Amino acid sequence: MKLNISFPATGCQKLIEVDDERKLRTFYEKRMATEVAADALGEEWKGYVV
Amino acid sequence: GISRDNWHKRRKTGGKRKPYHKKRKYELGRPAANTKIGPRRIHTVRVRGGNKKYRALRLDVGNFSWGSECCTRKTRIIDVVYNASNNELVRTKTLVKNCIVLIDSTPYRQWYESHYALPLGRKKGAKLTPEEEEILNKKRSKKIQKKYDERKKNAKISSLLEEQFQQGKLLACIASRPGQCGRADGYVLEGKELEFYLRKIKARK
Amino acid sequence: ADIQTERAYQKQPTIFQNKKRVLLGETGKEKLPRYYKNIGLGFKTPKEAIEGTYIDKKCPFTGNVSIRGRILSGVVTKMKMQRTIVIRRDYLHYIRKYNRFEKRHKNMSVHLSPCFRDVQIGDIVTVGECRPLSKTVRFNVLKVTKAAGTK
Amino acid sequence: ARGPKKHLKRVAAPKHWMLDKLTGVFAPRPSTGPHKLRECLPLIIFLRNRLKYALTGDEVKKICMQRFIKIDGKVRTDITYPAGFMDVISIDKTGENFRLIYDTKGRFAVHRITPEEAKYKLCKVRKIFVGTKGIPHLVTHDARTIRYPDPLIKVNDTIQIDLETGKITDFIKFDTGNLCMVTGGANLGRIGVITNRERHPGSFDVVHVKDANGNSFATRLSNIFVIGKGNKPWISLPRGKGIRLTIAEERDKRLAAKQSSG
RNA sequence: AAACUGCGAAUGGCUCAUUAAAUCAGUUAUGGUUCCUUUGGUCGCUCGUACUUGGAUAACUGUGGUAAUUCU
RNA sequence: UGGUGACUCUAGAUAACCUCGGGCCGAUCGCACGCCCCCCGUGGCGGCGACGACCCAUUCGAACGUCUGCCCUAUCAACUUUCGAUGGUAGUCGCCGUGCCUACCAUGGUGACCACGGGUGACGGGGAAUCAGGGUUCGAUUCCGGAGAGGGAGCCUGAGAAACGGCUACCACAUCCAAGGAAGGCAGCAGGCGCGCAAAUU
RNA sequence: CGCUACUACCGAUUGGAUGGUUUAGUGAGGCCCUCGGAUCGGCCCCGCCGGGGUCGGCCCACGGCCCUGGCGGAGCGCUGA
Ligand SMILES: [Mg+2]
Ligand SMILES: [Mg+2]
Ligand SMILES: [Mg+2]
Ligand SMILES: [Mg+2]
Ligand SMILES: [Mg+2]
Ligand SMILES: [Mg+2]
Ligand SMILES: [Mg+2]
Ligand SMILES: [Mg+2]
Ligand SMILES: [Mg+2]
Ligand SMILES: [Mg+2]
Ligand SMILES: [Mg+2]
Ligand SMILES: [Mg+2]
Ligand SMILES: [Mg+2]
Ligand SMILES: [Mg+2]
Ligand SMILES: [Mg+2]
Ligand SMILES: [Mg+2]
Ligand SMILES: [Mg+2]
Ligand SMILES: [Mg+2]
Ligand SMILES: [Mg+2]
Ligand SMILES: [Mg+2]
Ligand SMILES: [Mg+2]
Ligand SMILES: [Mg+2]
Ligand SMILES: [Mg+2]
Ligand SMILES: [Mg+2]
Ligand SMILES: [Mg+2]
Ligand SMILES: [Mg+2]
Ligand SMILES: [Mg+2]
Ligand SMILES: [Mg+2]
Ligand SMILES: [Mg+2]
Ligand SMILES: [Mg+2]
Ligand SMILES: [Mg+2]
Ligand SMILES: [Mg+2]
Ligand SMILES: [Mg+2]
Ligand SMILES: [Mg+2]
C-alpha cells in the first residue's frame, strides 16, 4: 500500500510506501473526501489531518 | 424505438408488404405526456430542426376566456369532469385538449362587479364586507353614474352561469395541447354547448 | 338534437354562437350564421350546403379542406361507409406489340359531403384532389350528375 | 443520402457551361446564392473558360483573393459564386464591365457594356406581401427584398434597380406590346413582343411572343422577363438581337462569311 | 509548439444482399412540413460595475497506478 | 392594407398569457486614425471590416402525397378483420397531412379487368446486342434515384444520421493476457486465405 | 422368360444436416416517468487578521454603523447544482 501525500500550501507531493496493517487500520471502511487523523503513520504526524 | 411510419401497415387490398428500409430517425415517436393537476412541472424536448417542445407534466393554472364578455383571466384548475375520447382520462385527472374542467370564478366575479357595479355570486343573506360595499356603492359623479347606469341595461346573465358563480366554480374547455406547448388554455362553456355537456355529465353519473 | 350524435359537441370552429344579445333579438330567431366558401375552378356551392345545418370538417364547402391538384371523374359503385363512397374509373391500356388495347379499371374511395343527397349507384361524380383525409382517401366529391335514365 | 450533397459530376453539370468530358471527373458545384444551381454561371467558369484570364483553378483563386472582381458592385472572393441573369461584373484593374445575358443559343454570353450602364440592373418582381406594421415588401428574382415599393407595382413586372443604393428608379408593367426575353425552356434566349396571355386557373399560364422578323412562339409565364416598354429595350443587347436563325440560314451566313474572308 | 474554443467529419468511395405498385420513370402537390450555409430585409420600434461584472478548467509545473489501450 | 382559381391567407383592433429543462432586444475582435468644445477633461464625437444573434425572404435540399406504367406462376380462387382490416368522432404522438397510435362507434375494403399466395441465377431507369418491317434477349458495372456496412435491435451529438474508418447490448466468429482484464468489423486503396471455368501493384 | 448396365420412381425406418416460421415462458440494453441524494457551492451565526469612509469619548490609543479582502467552527438552519 502506497500513499501519495500532497501539501497544497507548499504544493509539494511525496510518495511513501507503508508496509503495516496498524498504520492502515484507521483508513479502512472510509469513503472519499473524509477527514482522518494521520497519527498512526508514525511520530512525525502528530496533529496532522488528512 | 416508437415508430409512426406507414410501411408496417397492411395494404388496401389486405395483403401485407415487405419493408425495404429500416426505421428512420424522422419517423420516430415519443411517449405521451400525461399531464396531471399539481404544482407546475414542465420538461423541454429537443425536436427536429433544433426547436423546442414544452412537455407539461404538471399544471395547476391557466388563462381562460369568457367569450361573451370578452374577459380573459388567469385562473387555477380544480378538477376534470368530462372527457369525450375516454373516461379513463377523467378517472386519472389528465389534462388534454377538449377536456372539460372546473376552474375558479373569483377573477371573473371581480371583473363583473368592477364593470357593471352589480352583485354576482352573492348569497341571499346579503352579508357584506366594506371593501365590496365601496366597490359597488362608491360615490360617483353625474357623468360617471350616467355611464354606469347605461351599462346596467346590458347587465344580464343566464341562469346556468349565475348558478355556477353561486357554486364558485365554472365549467371550461381546454383548447391548447398541454403536451406540446406546456400550457393549458381554454374558454368558459356557455350556451347550447354548456347544456350539452351538462346533460352528458348528468347522464354519466 | 339530430346533429348532436357524438360524445363530443359538434360545432363549426369559425362561428361564435355564444354572442350575447338583448331579450328582443332573442325572441326573433335562433339562427346560427352558416360558414361556407367558394372552392374555385368554376364549381358552384350547392344550396343544401348554404342552407343546411350539418357539421362536416371534411366538406369541401363548409369544412377545413383545400382543393388543389387533379380533377377526376368516376361512376358511383358502392355507398356503404359513413360519408365516403367507392367509385370506379375505367380506361384502356395500349399494348405496343399487338397495336391493340385492353380494358382496365381502378377503384377510388372518396369523401362524400352531406350536401350531396339523392346520390344513387351508377351516376357520374366529379372529384377533386386534397390532402390525405384517411389511410386511403385523397379525393373529395365536387359535383354529382345523374345517370341517363333520369326521369 | 443523410444530408446535403457537396459535389457535382462533370457530365451532370448544366450543358450551357460547355464543359468538356476528358478534363476531369468533377465540375465546380455552385455555391448557394441569389440564383439557382441550374440557372447560374459560376465565377470560375466565367473567369477561366470564357475570358481565358486563368489557366487553372488555382489562378482563379489568386485573381479573386486580390479583390479585383465585383458582382453587382460588391467584391466577391468566392470562386463558385452563382452569377445569374442580368448581373453586372466589374473588373476595375482592366476597366471592364460585363452583363450576363443569354444569347440566342441559350448560353450566357460575354457581353461588354459601358461603365455608365453598369450602374443599374433589371429585376423581375416575384412576390408582393405586407409585413409587420403594414409595410409593403417586394421580392425580386435575385432574392432582393425592397421595402415600400410603388403601389402600382405588381407581380411579373420589371423594376430598374440602381446598384449603388439598391433602390427602384422606375418600372415596366406586364402588358401586351412590351418587349420580353425568354429565360427558360426551348425558346431560351429569344427576344420578342408579347401578343396575348392565356390564363389557366389552377395551372400554368401561356404567353405568346413574336419577334422582329415575325416568327411566333409560346412559353410559360414563369419563363418571361420584361426587358423594355414597347419595342425599345432598357438594356444593351448582344450581337444577335434575339432572333433565332434556322440551321439552313446559319449555314448560309457562315458560307457567305467564309467567301468574303480573304 | 501545445492546449481550450469554432467548423467539418451525414460529402466522397464500395457493393447489389434485401426489395414485385415496393424501388423506379414521366407528371403534379405541399393552401399539410423542416431546412446548416450563401444572398437580401429587420436589429435605439419595448417607457422599466456599465470607462466592462463572476466562478472555474486545460496546455504548463510536480506526485502516481496497472502485464496491457489514443486508460487516466 | 395587399394577394390567390380557392384561406380558417397576409395585415389591423381588443382581453390576457408568456414555461427557471427560461425566445430577441451585442459586457466580442482587427486596421487606419482623425474633427469639436465655456477644453486641456470621466474629454466628446466619428470610417472600413471580422464574429454572433430572434424573425421573414432566397439558395441547396430532404420528407410525405396525386395519375399512369413491371417478369413467370391457378398442381395458388377467394383474401383482410382475435393482435387495425375499411370508414366516422375526439384526442395522443409526430416537423407536419393521415388507423401513425388510443377510446367509443358502423361493417366495411380487395378480387377472372387475375385479388391473395409462391418463384425469380429480380436493385429500378438513362441504355446494350441482334435486327427488312414487326420483334427477341440483356442491363452487378463509372450518370440519376434506392439500400447496406457480419445479423438484428437501441441510441448520443448535431441543421441534417437510427451514422457504423460514432457509441451500447444480444447472436456468430475472432485478437492480446501476467487470467485479474483489454480491444474488434476492408461490400474504401493495395494486399492475403478460401471459393471456383472465371479477374491486376502491399 | 433367362443374361448385362443406367436414369427416374415408390417406401421399414430413423441419423449428419441446416434454413424459415410461429404458441407460450423468460428477457440484455437504450430511452421516458416517479423517486434518490455520494458530493460540491452560495446566504445567515461567532472569532481573530487586514484596507475605505464616517459617529462617539477624543490627541496619534480604542469602540459604534456600513462596506470590503482572507482564515477557523457550528447549526439534520436555508437555498442552487
Ligand atoms: Mg434494405
Ligand atoms: Mg406491331
Ligand atoms: Mg454516399
Ligand atoms: Mg462549391
Ligand atoms: Mg478541436
Ligand atoms: Mg457536423
Ligand atoms: Mg476508387
Ligand atoms: Mg415519380
Ligand atoms: Mg406538411
Ligand atoms: Mg436560411
Ligand atoms: Mg390576423
Ligand atoms: Mg385527427
Ligand atoms: Mg380517425
Ligand atoms: Mg438479388
Ligand atoms: Mg433486370
Ligand atoms: Mg426492327
Ligand atoms: Mg428479322
Ligand atoms: Mg443499366
Ligand atoms: Mg443497374
Ligand atoms: Mg448477383
Ligand atoms: Mg450509384
Ligand atoms: Mg445507412
Ligand atoms: Mg462492409
Ligand atoms: Mg464481409
Ligand atoms: Mg454489426
Ligand atoms: Mg452542425
Ligand atoms: Mg448502424
Ligand atoms: Mg471500413
Ligand atoms: Mg462511411
Ligand atoms: Mg481490399
Ligand atoms: Mg486493413
Ligand atoms: Mg479473365
Ligand atoms: Mg486466382
Ligand atoms: Mg428496460
Curated annotation (Swiss-Prot), chain A:
Cross-link (Glycyl lysine isopeptide (Lys-Gly) (interchain with G-Cter in SUMO2)): K14
Function field: Component of the 40S small ribosomal subunit. Plays an important role in controlling cell growth and proliferation through the selective translation of particular classes of mRNA. Part of the small subunit (SSU) processome, first precursor of the small eukaryotic ribosomal subunit.
Gene name of this polypeptide: RPS6
Quaternary data: Component of the small ribosomal subunit. Part of the small subunit (SSU) processome, composed of more than 70 proteins and the RNA chaperone small nucleolar RNA (snoRNA) U3.
Compartments where found: Cytoplasm; Nucleus, Nucleolus
Similarity comment: Belongs to the eukaryotic ribosomal protein eS6 family.
Post-translational modification: Ribosomal protein S6 is the major substrate of protein kinases in eukaryote ribosomes. The phosphorylation is stimulated by growth factors, tumor promoting agents, and mitogens. It is dephosphorylated at growth arrest.
Source organism (scientific name): Homo sapiens
Part of the full-length chain shown: 1 to 50 of 249
Name used for this protein in its record: Small ribosomal subunit protein eS6
Swiss-Prot record, chain B:
PROSITE patterns in UniProt: RIBOSOMAL_S8E (PS01193)
Residue numbers of Phosphothreonine PTMs: T129
Record membrane topology: Lipid-anchor
Biased composition (Basic residues): 7-25
Region (Disordered): 1-26
Record's keyword terms, sorted: Acetylation, Cytoplasm, Isopeptide bond, Lipoprotein, Membrane, Myristate, Nucleus, Phosphoprotein, Ribonucleoprotein, Ribosomal protein, Ubl conjugation
Location of the protein in the cell: Cytoplasm; Membrane; Nucleus, Nucleolus
Residues modified to Phosphoserine: S159
Gene Ontology biological process terms in this record: cytoplasmic translation; maturation of SSU-rRNA from tricistronic rRNA transcript (SSU-rRNA, 5.8S rRNA, LSU-rRNA); ribosomal small subunit biogenesis; translation
Covalent cross-link (Glycyl lysine isopeptide (Lys-Gly) (interchain with G-Cter in SUMO2)), residues: K169, K192
A Pfam family hit: Ribosomal_S8e
N6-acetyllysine PTM positions: K36, K127
Cystine bridges: none
Coiled coil (UniProt feature): none
UniProt GO MF annotations: RNA binding; structural constituent of ribosome
GO cellular component: cytoplasm; cytosol; cytosolic ribosome; cytosolic small ribosomal subunit; endoplasmic reticulum; extracellular exosome; focal adhesion; membrane
Lipidation (N-myristoyl glycine): G1
CDD domains: Ribosomal_S8e_like
Its biological purpose: Component of the small ribosomal subunit. The ribosome is a large ribonucleoprotein complex responsible for the synthesis of proteins in the cell. Part of the small subunit (SSU) processome, first precursor of the small eukaryotic ribosomal subunit. During the assembly of the SSU processome in the nucleolus, many ribosome biogenesis factors, an RNA chaperone and ribosomal proteins associate with the nascent pre-rRNA and work in concert to generate RNA folding, modifications, rearrangements and cleavage as well as targeted degradation of pre-ribosomal RNA by the RNA exosome.
Swiss-Prot record, chain C:
Keyword check for Phosphoprotein: yes
Secretion signal, residue range per the UniProt entry: none
Residues with a covalently attached lipid (S-palmitoyl cysteine): C59
Disulfide bonds: none
Annotated compartments: Cytoplasm; Nucleus, Nucleolus
Residues carrying Phosphoserine: S66, S109
N-acetylalanine modification, residue list: A1
PTM annotation: Citrullinated by PADI4.
Membrane-crossing segments per the record: none
Modified residues (Citrulline): R21
Keywords, in A-Z order: Acetylation, Citrullination, Cytoplasm, Lipoprotein, Methylation, Nucleus, Palmitate, Phosphoprotein, Ribonucleoprotein, Ribosomal protein, RNA-binding, rRNA-binding
Modified residue annotations for Omega-N-methylarginine: R68
Stored InterPro entries: NA-bd_OB-fold, Ribosomal_uS17, Ribosomal_uS17_arc/euk, Ribosomal_uS17_CS, Ribosomal_uS17_N
PROSITE patterns membership: RIBOSOMAL_S17
UniProt cross-references to SUPFAM superfamilies, sorted A to Z: Nucleic acid-binding proteins (SSF50249)
GO biological process, any: ribosomal small subunit biogenesis
GO cellular component labels: cytoplasm; cytosol; cytosolic ribosome; cytosolic small ribosomal subunit; extracellular exosome; focal adhesion; membrane; nucleolus
Any one Gene Ontology molecular-function term assigned to this protein's record: structural constituent of ribosome
Residues found modified as N6-acetyllysine: K37, K44, K57
Subunit structure: Component of the small ribosomal subunit. Part of the small subunit (SSU) processome, composed of more than 70 proteins and the RNA chaperone small nucleolar RNA (snoRNA) U3.
Family designation: Belongs to the universal ribosomal protein uS17 family.
Protein name: Small ribosomal subunit protein uS17
Curated annotation (Swiss-Prot), chain D:
Keywords, alphabetical: Acetylation, Cytoplasm, Isopeptide bond, Nucleus, Ribonucleoprotein, Ribosomal protein, RNA-binding, rRNA-binding, Ubl conjugation
UniProt-annotated location(s): Cytoplasm; Nucleus, Nucleolus
SMART domains (UniProt xref): S4 (SM00363)
GO biological processes: cytoplasmic translation; positive regulation of cell population proliferation; positive regulation of translation; ribosomal small subunit biogenesis; translation
CDD domains reported in the protein's UniProt record: KOW_RPS4, S4
GO cellular component: cytoplasmic ribonucleoprotein granule; cytosol; cytosolic ribosome; cytosolic small ribosomal subunit; extracellular exosome; focal adhesion; membrane; nucleolus
Cross-link Glycyl lysine isopeptide (Lys-Gly) (interchain with G-Cter in SUMO2) residue location(s): K229
Residue positions where N6-acetyllysine is found in the record: K232
GO molecular function list: RNA binding; rRNA binding; structural constituent of ribosome
Gene3D superfamilies recorded: 2.30.30.30, 2.40.50.740, RNA-binding S4 domain (3.10.290.10)
Domain of life of the native organism: Eukaryota
Boundaries of every S4 RNA-binding domain copy: 41-103
Subunit structure, as described in the record: Component of the small ribosomal subunit. Part of the small subunit (SSU) processome, composed of more than 70 proteins and the RNA chaperone small nucleolar RNA (snoRNA) U3. Identified in a IGF2BP1-dependent mRNP granule complex containing untranslated mRNAs.
Family statement: Belongs to the eukaryotic ribosomal protein eS4 family.
PANTHER family in UniProt: 30S/40S RIBOSOMAL PROTEIN S4 (PTHR11581), SMALL RIBOSOMAL SUBUNIT PROTEIN ES4 (PTHR11581:SF0)
Name the UniProt record assigns to this protein: Small ribosomal subunit protein eS4, X isoform
Organism: Homo sapiens (Human)
Gene name, Swiss-Prot/TrEMBL: RPS4X
